[PDB]
Write an enzyme that holds these catalytic residues in place. Structure first.
Site, mmCIF file in Angstrom:
data_model
loop_
_atom_site.group_PDB
_atom_site.id
_atom_site.type_symbol
_atom_site.label_atom_id
_atom_site.label_comp_id
_atom_site.label_asym_id
_atom_site.label_seq_id
_atom_site.Cartn_x
_atom_site.Cartn_y
_atom_site.Cartn_z
ATOM 1 C CG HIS A 137 -1.951 -0.995 1.209
ATOM 2 N ND1 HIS A 137 -3.316 -0.792 0.991
ATOM 3 C CD2 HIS A 137 -1.824 -2.196 1.320
ATOM 4 C CE1 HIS A 137 -4.115 -1.968 1.052
ATOM 5 N NE2 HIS A 137 -3.082 -2.880 1.339
ATOM 6 C CG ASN A 189 -7.579 -4.115 1.478
ATOM 7 O OD1 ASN A 189 -6.899 -3.273 1.803
ATOM 8 N ND2 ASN A 189 -7.187 -5.467 1.338
ATOM 9 C CE1 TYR A 230 -1.389 -5.595 9.196
ATOM 10 C CE2 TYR A 230 -1.600 -3.177 8.768
ATOM 11 C CZ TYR A 230 -2.030 -4.477 8.385
ATOM 12 O OH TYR A 230 -2.896 -4.767 7.443
#
Ligand code: HEM
Ligand code: HEM
Ligand code: HEM
EC number: 1.11.1.6
Lengths: 677, 323, 678
Positions: free
Chosen positions: A65, A138, A352
């Site tokens: 992304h 998403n 993350y």
């Protein structure tokens, strides 16, 4: 102002003298030299401090992304939802919470085009008064894989080939379709990415999904399984592939410009936050396992419940400090929400947090202005690179007599602490396996395909046709056909035509005719045409410009953004033909008199590429846009072989053209113009 | 083989079992879980070592020239040039030196299109037997600015607007032309970038330039002023703008794919290395200062003297590790 | 409050619930587990955000001066000095500027001992209203080397051997003395490091030096050459080596705790800022080149002129965020000051900026609270790792029509900009050489040595004897002696004795008998005894404790820090004999009655190591401290062979001992107790 907390770090350089980074006024337009034509001195501290900061401007792009854009806003709750969740930001009617949202593609690097075909990210941070809560979703409700340990395999295969780093921001190469066919779970997201979801008109025209099942948890510990949904108030809209390709070159920033322009013009986009809520004992009762992220829950089985509304109304001031630096985490969770045993979600939580150490080169990234919560941070963490605070508690440990027990522990009953869902159990052997309830990879791809309009289906087929025709290895193409044939023999046959291959015989095991609502894009007209763009093809000769101006004023009353185009920038002209392209517009209108630039020398001025006006009208027509011509400009439509009684084509007097264009913009795409097999 | 020295660091995985980065064979297609439909365990060292490396794959892009591609090759000297330089790689006829060349644009980030209009980088490394020698050049003989302290000003003004990061890989916006007109030194390179040099057909159809005047020094210390030139044996060729725009969308990789295919098919591209040689007392003889990088030296005053030829004939094996 | 600007980044956790770093209240004393005796779950986001932050707490230590401590304070200008400099922090009488000072050793890593023998760092930041001005100095006025390109060579040779990383924080090994004798410019700083400057009593008892010649520049461009001096108002004071060695182990934090205690107790230390001022035409007038940092300018040729005073009165709140993170730079220069062509200073300017990239792993270290100026930052710098601001000017380039010329250029005439000294010129060929005016490496070491007292000279000799005897290579030791012989045949001869070698014949080329003032330590008594420490050896048995309390009360009246020592922590006992050592005190006093723990049953308690009371008094005597005994406690003095009539030994009634100890504390060290060669 959603950006209110950020004003204390804003720096205004208006009216000031240049300084170094350690203070002191300077001049920094000449190096210090030893003599008139002499070498630069190492003692020129001004040069080195200015150039060192330039030399070190770049930080690593996100591993996925990397290409995206964002904005600030406010989320407002519609009710007191305490009966389903203890989440503070959902705890009262009309309660407001600041947000930041970043939209993105997935595969391309930082400077790849917005209109590449791809899954699209839709990440939302709620700066709640009980900590930051992120929904990192998403624009597609299902993901490619069922276990987070496979994410590097998926991403490596989709991203460019590691020998030559070709192709940029594209799944149309051997390695992606090798993986798609070797790992058949990927087929559901694949079909979504091959639909309009892969080429949306803008960020504002996308829905959003958390994909995973999560849990909402009340104060006493009662839980429900939950799916998060964002429902765009602007309506879903998509491009066509041949259009998106040209747009990738004419304006790589099409989507981030669209979002910036809507917010700046006072047309803030909005989304409703909605949920499907499922009893714990029905986790496996709907024909699949709700822990499986390659499946969505048909709304017929569980309708959406609307929790509140989000509106994005403030652009960033510095893109890098705000959009580029913000660090989303699905582990950013608050009291009243919990995880599930979704093996894809499970691994994201690790990944993350860890990746921020690469992107920000330190552990204090939560101290950056864009990442800070509004609710205050009190713990015994100390030091690390870039430590921006000065802690007062000398006894930075727990438990302790010397700090009087502060900062104190918080749990389910004290201090409104986070707590894991109390009824959650573990049972069985430690295993490196996936549950057999995850085994069906074809039924829901078929369900999705069944639920598109006929031309929408043709778009999916033609996407697979275009993509797989770039696969050089013949056996991989056959592998793809075999997998597609397990979803639908008709799909495999129609793709097989383009590859010069024989489609397999029907394999009926997973075939079915079930349909579900809500997954189509082109079967619904838009709820508003505000912010949509009209290109008015005019000319500087004659009265055409005066009529174009009046045309522009009427269209703008409907909230349309109108660009008057002519050979050069005369008064009233917004853009030259040389700079103009149909990809920038949602509708194309020829002002009366401008037919003169569609033939002869009028179409061959040194001021623009030969045929440019004709190409804009041809492009707009063939890409399915509303096209129109006022009065004598009907000659332009005739010059390209277009007839007025076609759907989405408007001719006549200015009043008629305006009403027709504004109506056709609601239809947005005229699918009559696309052949079906 | 120009890549010969890199063989010792190449890793073959054919026929091999999967391992961690500290050895030991593993499977890495399932996370370890606490029960059949259970949560993932922290003690899954396999998951975390695999994902940690993935999570940390990226490094910062080049602050300028982020978009580009490269190849290995060989430079061959045409003569013994000891009369003009002590440089070892130029010291004998037919002496061969491995090179690596990276071509690029300037403004765009890592994934921007090859056929954006821009200055193009043309950077050559000679792995000589007396150290690495780099000619870090462009496909345009002159640069925008006269003092290096102004580079952040040029680049900031050309790169995307800092509020919205628009537009990608393009000078067609307010801040760029504000700078070009406020800093008139920039007009020369601007005209070159607005010409065919801004939209070349391929890396193989560019000339290259060191831009700056350097010095060649002999063993005894006598010096000559010098300009480096790369003359493409393929000829210079350019697109038209309206075509480059579409091509930016239809194939952002047009130039890197072109270079790759030319080498792969055995049509290795070549450039002759040439110099302009100027006596020290002529530094200001030709209507400008040869210390001024906004000017080039007209060939009527100093012809191009060919020193050797460079051929790029080996693609990289891993783009990240090499290019 | 000098720390006032830092109050907005201070965080108070009292009365609060525990949170993550992104907010939300939590508990963090139990990992989330799969069942009662189960494995920890990866979804335990609380565990990982807490342990990741702990796992990443450390940043690289400073490549040199890694070991140190510091404090905040205030600098006050004594006048309007616009006649010599445009610098704004010196432009008005009584003008106040916040400062932060860090003191340090050089060679040792972060955890090494304060009382190792070393050059000491003395770095001061003035947070002026025209930017941060740093004077990055040492406690010794000359440096080892004349060109900055040799700094990695010097430091590698002094720091531990690269095969085994031995020895920590010490020049007493082969590589250092190989370098010292191979690079004779190093001999001057070597002699200073072998004197009392190598083992100071505290940071507060050091002078400070900018070392380099800088330039002061007026508004109209007139320049003076300048040397920066810090003159301690506490007076200079040094330990002895045999004491500093034990102190390194008994309290590695001796110096940082001394500075902390003095500030918290309201005894803020002060230094005067003074300069030597000489015209440009004096650069080569005094028998050396003023661009050469291996020489100092004798005060007889240019006296000290005081400009103001600095007082350190605020300790840091978080050591790491303030002391560890602060980033000094000799390139931190302001309008009114300029550099010189000192080839050592020239390379420092590059090195300190670059090294911040390693320590802070990012270009935005100047945004850290402790590094931020108070005067305002306005430029076109953007982005970078950890960018902490949000810039409003979107036209981040110059020149520009769209930003209306802001931020605007400042220079000598407009906007009070920095400017290089207008008269400086360059002449000659580009060269990789040093000026032949740098060639004398021995005259000033001789001058320094000539200017010490006789016992002070023995300390230098005995430090070299100690250090050179660790050199294993015979030829290096010979090389050392030939270099020492060029400074003083007598020094070389007396050092050669300890090495079992023959000193070379006299080499009178550089010999001389000149002396200079201001370089000695032991030739001057202390100007105050405030903060100095008295250990009072008592006992819990009898009436000794009550007398020691009365002895403590009177001594504290004179501003002294008194520690009453006994066998256990009885009422009024500050420290046990098990925990006590003489290195901790500037004077040792046996309270009446305590003679019972110097012999007999009282000296053999399980509560302290055998002979501990006798060793404390023995150590204090032989390390040259004032020592004393009240009344019947003079038995303790007799038990260690010490008599009443000696200098620095006191006995009698409490009033007599208190008077004698307090005057002996001004002498500080009694040099009668150290043998001299001959
Ligand atoms: C339901 C599945 C997934 C969704 C909806 C999703 C969505 C996203 C989004 C929207 C972003 C960009 C956030 C932004 O705008 O900054 C992102 C980045 C990222 N994702 Fe995912 N992703 C999924 C699966 C995974 C998995 C399985 C992994 C690895 C185990 C992963 C690792 C990452 C990483 C490392 C980043 C970079 C984030 C950063 O650098 O700040 N993702 N993802
Ligand atoms: C004649 C003028 C110039 C030419 C011909 C030139 C050429 C180039 C080229 C070809 C590259 C890419 C090298 C590669 O492919 O990896 C590059 C990168 C770079 N240039 Fe320049 N450039 C010029 C001016 C400048 C100036 C004035 C500065 C700053 C003082 C500068 C700073 C940089 C930096 C920091 C990079 C990134 C290098 C890296 O990260 O490896 N350049 N330049
Ligand atoms: C007269 C000569 C010198 C003096 C008085 C001096 C003084 C100091 C002081 C006091 C510090 C510690 C600053 C602090 O407390 O953080 C320091 C550190 C340092 N010095 Fe020097 N030094 C000298 C020579 C040099 C030279 C010649 C170099 C290199 C060319 C150098 C490079 C460094 C570096 C890299 C640091 C670490 C700074 C940091 O990490 O923040 N020094 N020096």
């Amino acid at each position: 102002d959603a950006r209110q907390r950020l004003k204390e770090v804003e720096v205004d350089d208006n009216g000031q003298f240049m300084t170094t980074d350690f203070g002191g006024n300077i001049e920094e337009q000449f190096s210090l030299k030893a003599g008139g034509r002499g070498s630069t001195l190492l003692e020129d501290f001004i040069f080195r401090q200015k150039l060192q900061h330039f030399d070190h401007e770049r930080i690593p792009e996100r591993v996925v992304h990397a290409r995206g854009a964002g904005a600030h806003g406010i989320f407002t709750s519609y009710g007191d939802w305490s009966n389903i969740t203890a989440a503070s930001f959902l705890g009262a009617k009309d309660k407001q919470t600041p947000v930041f949202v970043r939209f993105s593609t997935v595969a391309g690097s930082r400077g790849s085009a917005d209109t590449a075909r791809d899954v699209h990210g839709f990440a939302t941070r709620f700066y709640t008064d009980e900590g930051n809560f992120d929904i990192v979703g998403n624009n597609i409700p299902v993901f490619f894989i069922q276990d987070a340990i496979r994410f590097p395999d998926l991403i490596h295969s989709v991203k460019p080939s590691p020998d030559n780093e070709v192709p940029q921001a594209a799944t149309a190469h051997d390695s992606a379709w090798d993986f798609f066919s070797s790992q058949p779970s990927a087929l559901h997201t694949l079909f979504w990415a091959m639909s309009g979801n892969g080429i949306p008109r803008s960020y504002r025209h996308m829905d959003g999904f958390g994909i995973h099942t999560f849990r909402l948890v009340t104060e006493d510990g009662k839980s429900k399984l939950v799916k998060w949904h964002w429902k765009t108030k602007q309506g879903k809209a998509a491009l066509v592939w041949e259009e998106a390709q040209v747009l990738a070159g004419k304006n790589a920033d099409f989507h981030r410009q669209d979002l910036w322009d809507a917010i700046e013009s006072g047309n803030a986009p909005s989304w409703e936050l909605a949920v499907q809520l499922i009893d714990e004992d029905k986790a496996q009762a709907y024909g699949f396992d709700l822990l499986d992220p390659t499946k969505f829950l048909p709304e017929e089985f569980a309708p959406l419940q609307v929790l509140g509304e989000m509106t994005l109304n403030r652009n960033p001031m510095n893109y890098f400090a705000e959009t580029e630096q913000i660090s989303f985490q699905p582990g950013h969770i608050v009291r009243g929400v919990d995880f599930t045993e979704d093996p894809l979600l499970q691994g994201r939580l690790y990944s993350y947090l860890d990746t921020q150490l690469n992107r920000h080169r330190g552990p204090n990234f939560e101290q950056l202005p864009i990442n800070r919560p509004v609710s205050g941070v009190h713990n015994n963490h100390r030091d690390g690179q870039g430590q921006a605070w000065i802690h007062k508690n000398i006894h930075h440990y727990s438990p302790s007599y010397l700090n009087k027990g502060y900062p104190a522990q918080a749990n389910q009953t004290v201090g409104r602490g986070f707590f894991t869902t109390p009824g959650r159990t573990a049972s069985g052997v430690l295993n490196r396996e996936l549950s057999a309830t995850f085994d069906d990879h074809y039924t829901q791809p078929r369900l999705f395909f069944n639920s598109l309009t006929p031309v929408e289906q043709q778009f999916v087929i033609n996407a697979i046709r275009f993509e797989a025709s770039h696969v050089t290895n013949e056996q991989v193409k056959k592998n793809v056909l075999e997998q597609l044939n397990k979803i639908s023999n008709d799909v495999a046959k129609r793709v097989a035509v383009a590859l010069g291959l024989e489609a397999p015989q029907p394999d009926p095991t997973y075939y079915h005719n079930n349909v579900t609502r809500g997954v189509s894009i082109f079967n619904e007209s838009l709820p508003t045409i505000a912010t949509l763009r009209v290109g008015v093809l005019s000319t500087t000769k004659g009265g055409s410009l005066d009529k174009a101006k009046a045309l522009k004023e009427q269209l703008e009353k409907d909230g349309l953004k109108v660009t008057v185009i002519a050979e050069y920038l005369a008064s009233g002209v917004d853009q030259t033909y040389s700079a103009a392209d149909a990809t920038a517009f949602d509708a194309v209108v020829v002002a009366e008199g401008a037919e003169r630039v569609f033939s002869g020398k009028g179409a061959m001025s040194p001021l623009f590429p030969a045929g440019r006006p004709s190409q804009i009208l041809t492009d707009g027509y063939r890409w399915g846009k509303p096209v129109a011509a006022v009065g004598s400009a009907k000659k332009a439509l005739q010059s390209i072989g277009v007839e007025e009684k076609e759907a989405g084509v408007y001719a006549g007097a200015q009043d008629e053209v305006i009403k027709g264009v504004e109506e056709g913009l609601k239809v947005f795409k005229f699918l009559e113009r696309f052949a079906v097999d």
